[PDB]
């Protein structure tokens, strides 16, 4: 699973980031090895929907305010 993440990252070597991937994406592999800190492991792009307002980038009321 780590090798698959490396292919998506386009880098052959499994960077510790690539090992951080394939661990949090699968719950079964996350139930194991869960309460751990991966050395030099980047966090998954977990973003809440509230952080992207959209709505024409204007006020909720009428017109651009």
């Amino acid at each position: 699973l780590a090798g698959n993440a490396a292919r998506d990252n386009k880098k052959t070597r499994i960077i510790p980031r690539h090992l951080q991937l394939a661990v949090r994406n699968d719950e079964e592999l996350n139930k194991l090895l869960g309460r751990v800190t991966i050395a030099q492991g980047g966090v998954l792009p977990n973003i809440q929907s509230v952080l992207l307002p959209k709505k024409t980038e204007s006020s909720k009321s009428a017109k651009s305010k």
Partner: protein, 180 residues
Amino acid sequence: MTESLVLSPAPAKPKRVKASRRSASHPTYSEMIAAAIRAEKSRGGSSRQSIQKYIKSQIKLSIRRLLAAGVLKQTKGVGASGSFRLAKSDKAKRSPGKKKKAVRRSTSPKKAARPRKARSPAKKPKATARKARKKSRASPKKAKKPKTVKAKSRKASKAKKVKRSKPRAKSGARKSPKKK
């Protein structure tokens, strides 16, 4: 600055004209709603649709801009629409505010509650005349005639001082409400 340089031809060539000889029309984005608010004829303030009617002669951005400039003070409400008003500055305290329960000036009743705290009763925020300090247990139809007897016993100079003093409160009662 093009918003005020190439759109400045808009106030350079508007069919309606402003800021000329005599106060025929109001300047744009400034003092436009001043006359409308001054001629309020309303309680609590104006509304958005009413202001749309008055302007007939970016409203939210203009309101925010005037807020930043510092010319508007309004009130909060939900049933009343809009509640738009400028800075008339008749009284900035408005601490009671009424709503069916208030305290007259919140100071003379406080000046009467101070003996309450100082003496035996030490009552919660309730304040009355002096005779309750002598008898906390009192009742209407009985706790008023001794006051009239005391007024009869006292002198015309004291009566005149009574007539003269609180007219200050008469003058002050119109400050905060600004009206009836």
